[PDB]
């Protein structure tokens, strides 16, 4: 329930030429409550943004924030971001989504996909300009699986989601999607007993907990849209797929579809291995 409070530095990706600055707005809301440090990063080689960065940092410090800034560039946008996260030890990366195609506005750019694949920490991809305050926060889990790996991921998802609901004075909602009649009737009864246990463990009301049958890759966005969720918290697949496919189909589809901000968490052992990879560089 305190996963956000426990994040002590946030890497804020600052864009030089856009007309929205949602990454910094989300960071200000969060740090306003958690008092996390904010490290502002511009990823560019050409222009000297130092004066603008200093002015911005001074304004934020006067507002009471702990702030550092930097401008860097090595190789690619996502690589620059991850190198900065490593150098500053940040526990969250916040970046605004800016689609390449105006006709496919929900699809993440290929570079942002690389960021999500390799970041060894939670990544908040902002996708809406709607304020978090008073909104609806949606946590996506699979109550149908309670093995050690899923319990851990789910606990993380709920912890971050609940902490967000708290800091934003918002409400918390949960979606769980799950893919001879006598036997089916018996198996489903047992699945329901497990949902009830999950509901008691996590103190969710019937109204908060959406238990839906069908493909998670459609159910999660359906629920987000119906709730007009402003943030959706999701986990990547517990076990990586072939050829380093560590995001998984559900999260891939959901990230390219949601209109809400998306907080992307990974399994602890995945994070550990990505931490190792990010360190080699």
Tokens at residue 171, please? 């409400």
Closest CA to 122 of 163, 77, 63, 75: 163
* Shortest CB 121 distance to Cl ion, Å: 8
Verify binding: residue 129, Cl ion, rule CB under 5 A: no
Residues 74-93, one symbol each (x = binds Cl ion by CB under 5 A, - = not), give: -----------------x--
Q: Which residues neighbour 11 within 8 Å (Cβ) at sequence distance 6 or greater?
A: 39, 41, 81, 84, 85, 88, 90, 92, 93, 94
Cα separation of 111 and 275, whole Å?
19
Closest CA to 140 of 119, 154, 124: 154
Cα separation of 173 and 209, whole Å?
6
CA distances to 162, 174, 226 from 232, in Å? 11, 9, 13
Verify binding: residue 247, Cl ion, rule CB under 5 A: yes
* Shortest CB 190 distance to Cl ion, Å: 33
* Shortest CB 196 distance to Cl ion, Å: 34
User: Which residue among 29, 33, 107, 271 contacts Cl ion (CB under 5 A)?
Assistant: 29
User: Residue 65's Cα: distance from chain center in Å?
Assistant: 22
Tokens at residue 112, please? 């942002």
Verify binding: residue 132, Cl ion, rule CB under 5 A: yes
Closer CB to Cl ion, residue 90 or residue 139?
Answer: 90
Residues 108-127, one symbol each (x = binds Cl ion by CB under 5 A, - = not), give: ---------x----------
Q: Binders of Cl ion: how many residues, by CB under 5 A?
A: 11
* Shortest CB 146 distance to Cl ion, Å: 25
Residues 154-173, one symbol each (x = binds Cl ion by CB under 5 A, - = not), give: --------------------
Verify binding: residue 7, Cl ion, rule CB under 5 A: yes
Verify binding: residue 245, Cl ion, rule CB under 5 A: yes
Which residue has the closest beta carbon to Cl ion? 91
Q: Which residues neighbour 238 within 8 Å (Cβ) at sequence distance 6 or greater?
A: 147, 149, 150, 153, 267
Verify binding: residue 24, Cl ion, rule CB under 5 A: no
Closer CB to Cl ion, residue 88 or residue 212?
Answer: 88
List of residues contacting Cl ion (CB under 5 A): 7-8, 25, 29, 91, 117, 131-132, 245-247
């Amino acid at each position: 329930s305190n996963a956000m409070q426990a994040i002590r530095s946030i890497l804020v990706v600052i864009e030089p030429d856009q007309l929205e600055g949602l990454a910094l707005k989300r960071a200000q809301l969060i740090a306003g409550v958690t008092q996390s440090h904010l490290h502002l990063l511009v990823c560019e080689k050409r222009r000297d943004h130092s004066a603008a960065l200093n002015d911005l940092a001074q304004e934020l410090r006067e507002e009471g924030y702990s702030v550092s800034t930097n401008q860097a560039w090595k190789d690619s946008l996502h690589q620059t971001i991850i190198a900065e996260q490593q150098a500053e030890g940040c526990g969250l990366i916040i970046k605004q989504h800016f689609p390449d195609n105006p006709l496919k506005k929900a699809i993440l750019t290929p570079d942002d996909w690389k960021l999500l694949r390799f970041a060894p920490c939670p990544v908040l991809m902002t996708k809406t300009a709607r304020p978090w305050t008073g909104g609806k926060i949606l946590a996506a889990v699979d109550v149908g699986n309670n093995d050690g790996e899923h319990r851990s991921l789910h606990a993380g998802i709920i912890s971050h989601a609940y902490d967000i609901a708290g800091l934003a004075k918002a409400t918390l909602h949960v979606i769980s999607a799950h893919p001879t009649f006598q036997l089916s009737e018996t198996i489903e009864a047992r699945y329901r007993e497990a949902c009830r246990t999950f509901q008691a463990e996590y103190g969710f009301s019937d109204e908060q907990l959406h238990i839906e049958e069908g493909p998670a890759d459609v159910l999660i966005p359906r629920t987000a849209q119906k709730l007009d969720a402003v943030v959706t918290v999701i986990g990547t697949v517990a076990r990586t797929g072939l050829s380093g496919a560590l995001i998984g189909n559900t999260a891939e589809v959901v990230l390219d579809t949601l209109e809400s901000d998306v907080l992307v968490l990974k399994p602890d052992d995945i994070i550990a291995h990505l931490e190792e990879l990010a360190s080699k560089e």
